[PDB]
Amino acid sequence: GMSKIFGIVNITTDSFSDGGLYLDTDKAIEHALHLVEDGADVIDLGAASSNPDTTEVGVVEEIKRLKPVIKALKEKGISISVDTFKPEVQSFCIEQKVDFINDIQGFPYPEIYSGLAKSDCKLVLMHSVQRIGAATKVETNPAAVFTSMMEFFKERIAALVEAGVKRERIILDPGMGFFLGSNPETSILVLKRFPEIQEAFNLQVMIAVSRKSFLGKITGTDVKSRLAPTLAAEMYAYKKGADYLRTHDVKSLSDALKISKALG
Amino acid sequence: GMSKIFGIVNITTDSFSDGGLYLDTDKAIEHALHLVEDGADVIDLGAASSNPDTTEVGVVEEIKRLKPVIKALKEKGISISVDTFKPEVQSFCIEQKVDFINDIQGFPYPEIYSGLAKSDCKLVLMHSVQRIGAATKVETNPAAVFTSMMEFFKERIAALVEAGVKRERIILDPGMGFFLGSNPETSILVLKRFPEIQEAFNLQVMIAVSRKSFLGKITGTDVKSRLAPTLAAEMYAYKKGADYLRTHDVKSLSDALKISKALG
Ligand SMILES: C=C1CN=c2nc(N)[nH]c(=O)c2=N1
Ligand SMILES: C=C1CN=c2nc(N)[nH]c(=O)c2=N1
Ligand SMILES: Nc1ccc(C(=O)O)cc1
Ligand SMILES: Nc1ccc(C(=O)O)cc1
Ligand SMILES: [Cl-]
Ligand SMILES: [Cl-]
Ligand SMILES: [Cl-]
Ligand SMILES: [Cl-]
Ligand SMILES: [Cl-]
Ligand SMILES: [Cl-]
Ligand SMILES: [Cl-]
Ligand SMILES: [Cl-]
Ligand SMILES: [Cl-]
Ligand SMILES: [Cl-]
Ligand SMILES: [Mg+2]
Ligand SMILES: [Mg+2]
């Protein structure tokens, strides 16, 4: 199987790798259209970041950013994912009939589970060692993190299914980078063992490594020179059977996947 | 095993990807020093190109370009390879005591074999469908090219060994891109089957794909946007056990190899 590409379109001011570049509505639409041209299957819209240096974005402001971009992309028939962890914003996305809701908190509020069940959109259920809120910088034990993540998925999937969410709507994301720990060994272990998530839960898995900190620690590179380590980790994940890849440089990943497919 | 990196330093005017950038002596030395900083094990110096659009460079001019660069790099203890197919230039490299002579013609002139035997430098024996001269654009049958290449290596190795060249000095390069054919299928087959060269001859193999045309035909990219397809093919070759990789972007390849090593 070939991994599907989520194209990151950050409509923020403080995204760790491209904050402020696509804050304007038309520039965000133009960026999304370019990523689709580059081979993106889904456009992941994020009007609020979640890196350790992020600043809280209000719900009204977040919906204001997403509203005209969703409208323009839905007009073109583009599959839309929204990277939001705020239940009121997620409820707005259900009304807009987007294809995915991408929650770094993994839908931890059962009060809205009945509303999620009535929708038909797919749910990207992400695990993090923080569980609630944006990423932080904390050292973790890789084996213990993988074990707790496996238990977290099992309980959260069961809670959503018990509330009426169809199981096949759930896509699992183990988290990566600071969502797993400040030491890169935890991210490395998850990258090596994520097929065990597909096997245990029989659900698709998304891998999101693009430009993240742990790549820079292994190679000694800042965020602007992280294309090569990103591509190395993304094609490792593709070769290992990742169902979705969430990336910034869609064109480079697509070209790299075309070469890997021709050689494999 | 980890592939060794040959850093390309073109002291030419018409190299297909970076011609004219490092024609100046000090700029070529500065580029070579940067590539060593980026992780290059060997610096491959080429004062004359061999792409299909190349222009013949005189022997006197070629030696004039290489002479001060070799001197500066030898002062720093840098391992030097010289990409030259002219016997008089190769004789100059033997006098300079460089570590490698990289011949796209695979040393086809037995008149100089006795001189090659007395030297201690390693010999990069490259195969091409043209055999003599620079690359051309010609469509070829992949299976027939691989078969003829295997026979070419067998006869050329035996001729060099019979003349006194120690067998362990020979590094095999199957050729790539236009050296194999204008259709990318021939390059793809050689990339998939080059371990058979190591097995049959018990010699090291060099893979040189960086920015070459066949990558652009598979992905639909010009020479300036070929980093991602280059990295995809280079780490495929590394994972398959290539002993040497000849590349332009040493820093990107090194960073990519560090990630692949940490994940493998
Ligand atoms: C930087 C971020 C923001 N949103 C994400 N969303 C998902 N699903 N996975 C990530 O790793 C992730 N990284
Ligand atoms: C573009 C070039 C010039 N010199 C080379 N040298 C070797 N050994 N192999 C190549 O593929 C090669 N490509
Ligand atoms: N949202 C996130 C953005 C970046 C990182 C990281 O660099 O590890 C983690 C989370
Ligand atoms: N010397 C060479 C340079 C480039 C190519 C190629 O693009 O195929 C082939 C030979
Ligand atoms: Cl960007
Ligand atoms: Cl709701
Ligand atoms: Cl800590
Ligand atoms: Cl739960
Ligand atoms: Cl850097
Ligand atoms: Cl360059
Ligand atoms: Cl000689
Ligand atoms: Cl032809
Ligand atoms: Cl011969
Ligand atoms: Cl292009
Ligand atoms: Mg974001
Ligand atoms: Mg050259």
Measured from the Cα of B51, ligand 2's closest atom is 1
Q: Are A128 and A179 within 8 A, CB to CB?
A: yes
**Whole-number Å distance between alpha carbons of B173 and B179:** 11
Final resolution, Å: 2.1
Taking Cα atoms as reference points, which of A232, A211, A179, A205 lies closest to residue A10?
A211
Experimental method used, please?
X-ray
Q: Where are the alpha helices (DSSP H) in A39-183?
A: 59-75, 87-96, 113-118, 142-162
CA distance A235 to A253: 8
Q: How much distance in Å is there from the Cα of A135 to the middle of ligand 3? A: 7
Is the alpha carbon torsion for A154, A156, A159, A163 positive or negative? Answer: negative
Q: What is the 3-state secondary structure (H, E, C) of chain B?
A: CCCEEEEEEECCCCCCCCCCCCCCHHHHHHHHHHHHHHCCCEEEEECCCCCCCCCCCCHHHHHHHHHHHHHHHHHCCCCEEEECCCHHHHHHHHHHCCCEEEECCCCCCHHHHHHHHHCCCEEEEECCCCCCCCCCCCCCCHHHHHHHHHHHHHHHHHHHHHCCCCHHHEEEECCCHHHCCCCHHHHHHHHHHCHHHHHHHCCCEEECCCCCHHHHHHHCCCHHHCHHHHHHHHHHHHHCCCCEEEECCHHHHHHHHHHHHHHC
The two structure tokens encoding residue A51? 């890196």
Cα radius of gyration (chain A): 17
- Please say whether the beta carbons of A70 and A33 come within 8 A: no
CA–CA gap between residue B2 and residue A244 (Å, rounded) = 29
Strands A42-46 and A80-83: parallel
Pull the structure tokens for residue B138: 């010609």
Phi, psi of B164 (to 5 degrees): 115, -5
**CA–CA distance, B208 with B178 (Å, rounded to integer):** 12
In angstroms, the CA A239 to CA A1 distance is 9
User: Using N-to-C axis directions, what is the helix angle for A59-75 and A25-38, rounded to 10°?
Assistant: 50
CB A260 within 8 A of CB B232: yes
The one-letter code for the residue type at A170 is: I
Q: What is the largest CA-CA distance in chain A?
A: 49
Q: Which among A61, A70, A79, A68 is positioned nearest to A12, based on CA atoms?
A: A61
Q: Name the residue of A51, A149, A173 whose CB sits within 8 Å of the most ligand 1 atoms, as the mutation to test its pocket.
A: A173
Q: Name residue B259's amino acid.
A: I
Cβ contacts of B155 within 8 Å, gap of 6 or more: none
Cβ–Cβ under 8 Å, residues B247 and B223: no
Report in angstroms the alpha-carbon separations of A113 from A110, A155, A211, B14, B119.
5, 14, 33, 64, 77
Say which DSSP state A213 is in: H
Measured N-to-C along each axis, helices A227-239 and A250-263 cross at an angle, to the nearest 10 degrees, of: 50
Q: For a ligand 4 pocket test, name from B126, B212, B248 the mutation site with the most ligand atoms within 8 angstroms of its C-beta.
A: B212
Q: Does the beta carbon of A124 sit less than 6 angstroms from any atom of ligand 1?
A: yes
Residue that the structure tokens 């589970």 belong to:
A113
Strands B206-207 and B170-173: unpaired
CA distance B60 to B92: 11
Number of separate helices (H) and strands (E) present in chain A: 10, 8
Q: Work out whether strand B4-10 and strand B244-247 pair parallel, antiparallel, or are unpaired.
A: parallel
User: B231 near A232, Cβ under 8 Å?
Assistant: yes
Q: How many CB atoms lie within 10 A of CB A66?
A: 26
CB of residue B153 inside a 6 A radius of ligand 4: no
At B109, list the tokens. Answer: 């002139």
Structure tokens at A245: 């890849």
A204: region left, alpha or beta (phi > 0 left; psi from -120 to 50 alpha) = beta
* Nearest residue of chain A to residue B238 (CA atoms): A232
- Determine the Cα–Cα distance for residues B128 and B149; give it in Å rounded to an integer: 8
**Where is chain B discontinuous (C–N over 2.5 Å), named by the preceding residue?**
none
Smallest Cβ–Cβ distance between A259 and the set B225, B233, B256 belongs to B233
B-contacting residues in A 75-134 (Cβ below 8 Å): none
Nearest chain B residue to A188, by CA: B263
Domains of chain B with bracketed CATH: 4-263 (3.20.20.20)
Q: How many CB atoms lie within 10 A of CB B263?
A: 18
Instruction: Please state, in angstroms and rounded to a whole number, the distance separating the CA atoms of residues B112 and B223.
Output: 36
Provide the 8-state DSSP code for A205. B
Q: Give residue numbers after which chain A breaks (C–N above 2.5 Å).
A: none
